[PDB]
Every structure is written in C-alpha cells, then in structure tokens.
Amino acid sequence: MDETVAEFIKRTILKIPMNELTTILKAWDFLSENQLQTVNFRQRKESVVQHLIHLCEEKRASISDAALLDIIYMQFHQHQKVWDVFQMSKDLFDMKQFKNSFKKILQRALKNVTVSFRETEENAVWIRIAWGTQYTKPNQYKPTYVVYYSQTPYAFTSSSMLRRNTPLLGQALTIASKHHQIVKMDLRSRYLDSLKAIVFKQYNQTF
C-alpha cells in the first residue's frame, strides 16, 4: 500500500479510543480474526498502530479500505459533526443503481474524488466523499458524510464550510435517486437519532 493510504489509516486508528479499538476493527472486517490475535492491545498506542499498519500492508489495503474504516469511525462517533437535514421531492431497481449513478456524477464533474459507501440494515446508505479538483488530489482529511434513507425523501449531511462543491452534492443526490428538487431544511443537530426522530415523525403525519 501507498504511503498516503498508510498515513490515513494511521491517523484514523490514532483517534480511536483504546477500549473501542477492538470493536471498530471487527466491524471493519478487513484484518482477519487471526491477524488481530497476534496484536497485543495492552501497551502504548504507538506500538499498537504500527503493528496494525503492518497488518494492512500484508492485506494490501487500498484507499477504499481506508475510507471504509473512516465511515465506521464516524458511525461510532456521529456526535463529532453537526448534521443538516435535506429534503427531496418527486423508482430505483436497486441500491447498487444509486451508488453507481452517484459515484459517476461526482467523478465526471471533478476528476479526482473518493466516493465510498456503507449500507446499514435500515435501507440506509452512508456516503463518504473526499473532495479534489480536476487538477488536485482528494483531501482525505476534510471529507463530507451523507446518510441517505432510501425509502424516504430525506438525506442527512455533515457541513464543514458549505463550499462550492455543496450545490454539486445536492445535484448528484437528487439525480441519482429518482428526485427532481432538493432543499436545505432549517434543522441542525449533533445527534442524528434526534433528527431522524423529527423528520420521520412529521413524514408520518402528512403521508
């Protein structure tokens, strides 16, 4: 693996608290049960991380594997970002249809972008987008996270600056599922569970 992907995995593991480490890594399901047995987790973090980075080399970790561990960190630490709610207005054959559509729209608009996915059993997708330009590489340390619940008109994003790549994200989301318009709602929270609670409650009154 490249030193860029190796560094990203290092900084990701470094910010994981020690007690959580063994649970996140199992959830990641990239390093094997056998590989992880060789690691003793009861010393300095710096020793733990270099052993784990070695194990990623053995397993030939790509950027996609790195991006997936990052999603899992975020899934276990949703509170670290402020989530905005977005509403769409109006069928897919599949979730795979959405993922390929969405990925292409972004990677055609700009050339350098990392678009990764994780599916949860709620018919929901986590999207992680690391933005780059036509000329510059993707910034893996300032990514955008999207949580789209497929059978709803609702999508939840983590806004950091609300950049020039923010109208494009709306566009891509809107096009990739069978929707015509997107609008930002005036609903912010650090807690996604609490936002789900308001938008899916008032989605049940109207329909």
Numbering used by the authors: 1 to 90, 97 to 213
Provide excerpts from the study.
A crucial role in this process is played by centromeres, specialized chromatin domains whose defining mark in almost all known eukaryotes is the enrichment of centromeric protein A (CENP-A, also known as CenH3), which replaces histone H3 in nucleosomes. The primary function of centromeres is to provide a platform for the assembly of macromolecular complexes known as kinetochores, whose task in turn is the physical capture of microtubules of the mitotic spindle. In vitro, these interact specifically and selectively with two CCAN components, CENP-C and CENP-N. Binding of these proteins to CENP-A nucleosomes has been shown to require two regions where the CENP-A sequence diverges significantly from that of histone H3, the L1 loop and the C-terminal tail. In conclusion, the structure of CENP-N contains an N-terminal Pyrin domain, a central CLN-HD, and a C-terminal CENP-L dimerization domain, while CENP-L contains an N-terminal CLN-HD, interrupted immediately before the C-terminal helix by an insertion that contains a region required for CENP-N dimerization.
We obtained well diffracting crystals of the CENP-N1-235 construct and determined its crystal structure at 2.8 Å resolution. CENP-N1-235 consists of two closely juxtaposed domains that interact through an extended interface to form a single structural unit. There is no clear density beyond residue ~210, indicating that the structure is disordered after this point. Besides identifying the N-terminal domain of CENP-N1-235 as a PYRIN domain, DALI also identified an unanticipated structural homology of the second domain of CENP-N1-235 with the N-terminal domain of Iml3CENP-L. We therefore refer to these domains of CENP-N and CENP-L as CLN-HD (for CENP-L and CENP-N homology domain). Monomers A and B in the asymmetric unit are quite similar except for a minor hinge-bending between the two subdomains of each monomer, and except for loops 137–142 and 164–174. Our study did not identify a clear structural basis for this phenomenon, as we failed to identify significant conformational changes in CENP-N in isolation (crystal structure) compared to its complex with CENP-ANCP.
